[PDB]
Scaffold this active site. Structure first.
Site, PDB file in Angstrom:
ATOM      1  CB  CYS A   1       0.721   0.004   5.215  1.00 29.63           C
ATOM      2  SG  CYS A   1      -0.772   0.846   4.746  1.00 29.63           S
TER       3      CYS A   1
ATOM      4  CD  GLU B   1      -1.334   2.480   1.348  1.00 21.60           C
ATOM      5  OE1 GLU B   1      -0.317   2.693   2.085  1.00 21.60           O
ATOM      6  OE2 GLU B   1      -1.880   3.386   0.638  1.00 21.60           O
TER       7      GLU B   1
END
Ligand code: SF4
Ligand code: SF4
Ligand code: FCO
Ligand code: F3S
Ligand code: MG
Ligand code: NI
Lengths: 544, 262
Positions: A538, A20
């Protein structure tokens, strides 16, 4: 042995895909081995700045948008955080519901990570076209449980689909993949590549079920909407028919985890045994999750069924309690104003100040969280080590199965291989506990459906919310002044794992873990991806 | 082999919730979409190539002889020449502007790309803007935080097979955003009867009373949430929680405090 080039010089990978968010990795390689590394996060949004002056009740709705992959976990941390600051203890049913939604999030998140984000570092999709489907069905009969999705016909069907796709000349998400044409670091037999690809497609469906389950309690996914200060709003989630569906979908998801995810992980693990010697670090931290008593942060730390702790220098014999006052963040090597080093989150400062690309003195939008001067790895591997050292029964049993199946020592887990295997280990454990946790909430809810406790907003207070999210130790810290947000700081697992160097010049976990990485082919540095991805980065979480 | 329309998907200042939402589609599932319907030629979250290989893949898509459609996830951070949001060493604003110039159509998935979204909320440290603002071109907006996949996939398919759907004043397809959440809410009877929950612990709440006094923004929010649900199972009000108005432009600033009407 492990393919390694003679390459000497720099390599930059930007973007790192299949994570991400926005990460640039820079390394220096010497004789085909990484000798130095930099983890450079490339986007700032500034939620902490945005929150200033707002209604503390609003915090969870802003912070949940720290990330949509690890959706929910921020709204949970924020809600824990404000519950602490207002000194409300949530009703048992809200503890249960909050924790079950976290469990559902693990299942969804980890399935998608292994298959859709990580597996393409180890599976050559195109080489599946070379496999014989009968020979693959036989081999599948020998690495995993019997199932119709693994029969020769099923594997031919996936193969034909993949073949028509590749022959169309529109390769899509596979365009320019590092495995096209063969690659020395890709070791699987075409028969295993077919099996994994089959499950990759199956997983794309199964995650829809995992999300559906989570949305029964969470209201929707992504971005749940069921938490409030003092508990949860979802009375209907305590009722029979919605719980019966929640159990049923959770069993299907858990069937897939046991039938496909774990055997796929173990096969990859057996083939890539050498990766048990690459990518290790030394320090592990967890706040724990799945507590039986969430009335305070102190109780969370103490009663998390996935225990909390600190391991240092790989010493499994001395698991320390977490000292929440010992956490701080540096910004010396980050893109923030001078003067920001060494800040406990309650005193946290987010004053953005960009310099230029690859400035070795300031090269990331992440702060650098340290613990008594030390970098800490967080996430499944940390949880696994801490649980194993403490003889948590479920971790003991399942870790031992793995080591017994792989025929490797427990020490082999301090590695990118172990980091990968830990993720699956804990997925199988959450799966084993779903029916118990569900039955405890159904019985409780039936007896009394209290779900939110009364509370009062203080004129002045402070509070901390802890969670162990899929990627590790998450904390949210609030200072309330005049019934408003005076300061709100997020310290997120990806900040711990992929931030830059701290004030002492000391590498973060990912940067240390990259040291000693072999590069078979500098044009296609899949080995960098293997390790980076094993941390499950992330960047939106990391930077917020 | 029938050619499948190329789609380029860009990630700017985003949380990846919109990607996550898109892959929850069941009619069809994401694999059937990308194997059979579109050619998804660049998508950072799931694509195999990384680094220069990935950038090259982008470059190939933008120069495809058949053209391509552009999906944008995330707002655009514009402070300091756009350098607070970068991919492959380039400002997100610059790459998006480049990709948009030749796109057959531009779809903004999510409130962030549509309108600016969470990073734009006061005091907007990154000076984030929506795509239509930042590029100066009309976009097809599929807002929500995130939008339902029914909405995004339906738009995509509509665009590739029928043309541009009808859009409201805020660029949203009327097929999905033509109705107020509140007008299709099962609680509406309670609202008409002035049967409000005063708190989440109240008997009123337990009885499923209307969530207006607790800040519900349903009455002013255009979306199809109660009609189509999320994940084939639920939506926020059914889970006892007020609507945040998350498909409305700048809702972070216009709908807050979330738990009040003031
Ligand atoms: S619209 Fe919402 S879910 Fe989508 S990228 Fe923006 S913050 Fe994330
Ligand atoms: S809960 Fe919200 S949407 Fe439903 S009737 Fe009340 S105000 Fe309208
Ligand atoms: N899991 C997760 Fe996301 C990260 N890092 C958060 O919190
Ligand atoms: S918060 Fe958003 S998802 Fe629907 S119910 Fe309200 S528009
Ligand atoms: Mg922070
Ligand atoms: Ni995240």
């Amino acid at each position: 042995p492990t393919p390694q080039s003679t390459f000497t010089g720099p390599i930059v990978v930007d973007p790192i895909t299949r994570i991400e968010g926005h990460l640039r990795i820079m390394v220096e390689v010497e004789n085909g081995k990484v000798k130095d590394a930099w983890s450079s996060s490339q986007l700032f949004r500034g939620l902490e700045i945005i929150l200033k002056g707002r209604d503390p009740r609003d915090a969870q709705h802003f912070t949940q948008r720290a990330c949509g992959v690890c959706t929910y976990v921020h709204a949970l941390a924020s809600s824990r955080c404000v519950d602490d600051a207002v000194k409300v203890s949530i009703p048992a049913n809200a503890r249960m519901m909050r924790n079950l939604v976290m469990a559902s999030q693990y299942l969804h998140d980890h399935l998608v990570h292994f298959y859709h984000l990580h597996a393409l570092d180890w599976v050559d999709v195109t080489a599946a076209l070379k496999a014989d489907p009968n020979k693959a069905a036989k081999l599948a009969a020998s690495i995993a449980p019997a199932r119709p999705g693994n029969s020769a016909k099923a594997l031919k069907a996936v193969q034909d689909k993949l073949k028509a796709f590749v022959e169309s000349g529109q390769l899509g998400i596979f365009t320019n993949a590092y495995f096209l044409g063969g690659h020395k670091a890709y070791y699987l037999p075409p028969e295993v590549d077919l099996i994994a690809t089959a499950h990759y497609l199956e997983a794309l469906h199964m995650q829809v079920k995992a999300a559906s389950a989570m949305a029964i309690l969470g209201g929707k996914n992504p971005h749940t909407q069921f938490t409030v200060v003092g508990g949860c709003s979802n009375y209907q989630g305590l009722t029979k028919d919605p719980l019966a569906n929640y159990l049923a979908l959770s069993k299907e998801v858990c069937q897939f985890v046991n039938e496909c995810y774990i055997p796929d992980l173990l096969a990859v693990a057996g083939f890539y045994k050498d990766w048990g010697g690459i990518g290790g670090t030394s320090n592990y931290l967890a706040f724990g999750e799945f507590a039986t008593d969430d009335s305070s942060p102190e109780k969370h730390l103490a009663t998390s069924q996935f225990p909390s702790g600190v391991i240092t220098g790989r010493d499994l014999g001395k698991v320390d309690n977490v000292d929440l006052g010992a956490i701080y963040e540096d910004v010396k090597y980050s893109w923030y104003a001078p003067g920001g080093d060494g800040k406990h989150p309650y005193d946290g400062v987010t004053d953005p100040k960009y310099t230029k690309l690859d400035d070795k003195d300031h090269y990331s939008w992440m702060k650098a969280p340290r613990y008594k001067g030390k970098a800490m790895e967080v996430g499944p591997l940390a949880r696994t080590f801490i649980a194993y050292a403490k003889g948590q029964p479920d971790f003991k049993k399942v870790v031992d199965m793995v080591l017994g199946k792989l025929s490797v020592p427990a020490t082999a887990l301090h590695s990118t291989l172990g980091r990968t295997a830990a993720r699956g280990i804990e997925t199988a454990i959450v799966c084993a506990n779903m029916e118990k946790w569900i039955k405890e909430m159904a019985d409780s809810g039936a007896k009394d459906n209290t779900l939110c406790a009364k509370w009062e907003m203080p004129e002045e207070s402070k509070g901390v919310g802890l969670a162990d999210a899929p990627r590790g130790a998450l904390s949210h810290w609030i200072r309330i002044k005049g019934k408003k947000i005076d300061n709100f700081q997020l310290v997120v697992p990806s900040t711990w794992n992929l931030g830059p160097r701290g004030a002492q010049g000391d590498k973060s976990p990912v940067e240390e873990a990259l040291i000693g990485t072999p590069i078979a082919d500098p044009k296609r540095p899949v080995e960098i991806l293997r390790t980076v991805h094993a941390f499950d980065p992330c960047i939106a979480c990391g930077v917020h | 082999a029938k050619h499948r329309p190329s789609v380029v998907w860009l990630h700017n200042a985003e949380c990846d919730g919109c990607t996550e939402a898109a892959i929850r589609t069941i009619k069809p599932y994401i694999d059937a979409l990308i194997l059979d319907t579109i050619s998804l030629d660049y998508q950072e979250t799931i694509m195999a190539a990384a680094g220069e290989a990935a950038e090259a893949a982008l470059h190939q898509a933008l120069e495809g002889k058949d053209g391509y459609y552009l999906v944008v996830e995330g707002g655009l951070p514009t402070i300091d020449g756009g350098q607070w949001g970068m991919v492959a060493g380039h400002p997100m604003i610059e790459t998006t502007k480049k990709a948009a110039a030749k796109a057959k159509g531009i779809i903004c998935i999510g409130t962030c790309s549509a309108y600016g979204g969470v990073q734009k909320a006061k005091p907007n440290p990154s000076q984030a803007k929506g795509v239509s603002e930042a590029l100066g071109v009309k976009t097809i907006n599929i807002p929500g935080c995130p939008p339902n996949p029914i909405n995004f996939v339906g738009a995509v398919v509509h665009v590739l097979t029928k043309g541009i759907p009808d859009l409201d004043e805020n660029g949203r397809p009327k097929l999905f955003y033509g109705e107020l959440v509140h007008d299709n809410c099962p609680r509406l009877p309670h609202f008409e009867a002035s049967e409000f929950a005063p708190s989440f612990d109240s008997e009123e709440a337990k009885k499923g009373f209307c969530l207006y006094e607790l800040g519900c923004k349903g009455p002013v929010t255009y979306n199809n949430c109660p009609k189509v649900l999320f994940n084939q199972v639920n939506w926020p009000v059914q889970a006892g929680h007020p609507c945040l108005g998350c498909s409305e432009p700048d809702f972070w600033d216009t709908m807050t405090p979330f738990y009040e009407q003031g």
